[PDB]
């Protein structure tokens, strides 16, 4: 089961940012509100010149609010695709936090927001083309993505920015870099084709083994350099490392190399059969996710 | 694009507590000066059918331990109501949200806050199936994890407390009155659920989603009426369709009637024959109408 980590710590950090007639979400940490620079753009169909929109900017055009309650804007700086809006009071519900840049294969959580209010929470994976499969409509921009580490530290890593012509979603980190360097402009960009995250598929077959599902298991083995060479030719990523699968291979007796071979055979399809109710290989769950949901670690 | 989501969990996170009796531990929900929790926590360690009326009579308050975020609460009294206990504590939860208690019906969607030792670790949306079970993810210690919904007015509906995992892996809970959904027992025995029925109302919503995303290779021009479909749905593992007109918002945007979609379900019954609908290779009943219209239009 795909899960999101709980969002209360992040809910208190989501504000409403208004510039003229355009509204989106921002993230209030200390006395800074970070939001997509789309909010200062003019209503036009052309490509936006953001340097010019920044220069002709009026601080009194801003309206930043938390649950119907208005914060005073002190200043605004521009960093890549985001704005840093300094305000006259710090957020007293600021959680202990860091900023981290996601890597393809990472999982995290979206808190989907509209006019500064959370409406929904779900776990996503950052894909190898640096997009996610989320759900957003108009207004969602600035919805944050986060992870909660074991110590309680929240990692802020995503601010929603665009939905591509394909439907895949794209945002930036809090430095202002867009993931995959997509343009926060109204132009059709076509993302490159998604690879299966071989690490997640391996986690899922181990999950299959712990659930007593073994009809698919190959007796034979293929090693890492062999698998990765085959991966580059078949819409799959390289496998990370065998040692980091230790806790799942200990509990199962089945080495990673055995599942790599099983991925080559089952690549051709199942033949009407299931594997945990799925009819194709599952890209969806990482190893950490598999491990926390069967063992609580 | 349909993504199974949970409603925000923050207001529920402040009501979760650790409830301990002797050495046994589970979770509960603290509202006002009451903590509700499964009565299993006062069971004795004995592999036979628990005598809950006797274990209640031998119960001793000082054996209870109830804490929020490590901060312990004093128990003042305990009463048993079906399969849950109501524990009175000597201070009120200041973060008690406006709330009611609702019993779910088959087909209802709601949200689980998966909890262990009084700390939330995960949140997800679920649908109550026709066999009064849910497909969730829980390990030992999760008992008492709450199920909830948030109404448009901001009222949290508390509706579920996790009790048991059946041999098949499906999950059963109780509501806050103490009733177990499906009249399952909260005993370490072997009970077997009935076969699950595909939720026809959600398959209709799902097929509407597919049309609004431009996936319509499956679409039937044939119409079958509600009566005809309900009769067919019996013999093939689907529920009846409740109504038609609640989809009118979608019928208008696609030009397709509900009767075409029910003919399409009979036509799509076996499988898709290689093709897919929104990447799904068989019919999908995860999303309700309300989910589809909200995620796609914000209503
Ligand atoms: C020719 O043009 C295109 C061609 C092909 C693909 C394209 N894609 C985009 C795009 O995505 N454009 C951003 C605006 C840019 C300037 C950042 C946007 O629309 N973001 C939404 C979130 C979206 C709303 C629907 N689902 C979401 O995820 C906001 O939330 C904020 O914009 P608004 O709130 O509507 O003002 C334009 C475009
Ligand atoms: C032994 O005969 C059986 C035969 C076949 C299937 C069976 N299933 C159950 C059952 O489910 N038993 C309840 C206890 C009582 C109410 C009977 C239980 O195990 N609940 C777990 C959650 C469960 C645990 C794993 N996944 C979950 O969802 C907690 O909530 C924490 O319980 P503990 O921490 O271990 O005290 C007994 C049984």
From Swiss-Prot, chain B:
It comes from Human coronavirus NL63. Responsible for the majority of cleavages as it cleaves the C-terminus of replicase polyprotein at 11 sites. Recognizes substrates containing the core sequence [ILMVF]-Q-|-[SGACN]. Inhibited by the substrate-analog Cbz-Val-Asn-Ser-Thr-Leu-Gln-CMK. Also contains an ADP-ribose-1''-phosphate (ADRP)-binding function. The active site is at 40 (for 3cl-pro activity), 143 (for 3cl-pro activity). This is 3C-like proteinase. Residues 1-299 form the Peptidase C30 domain.
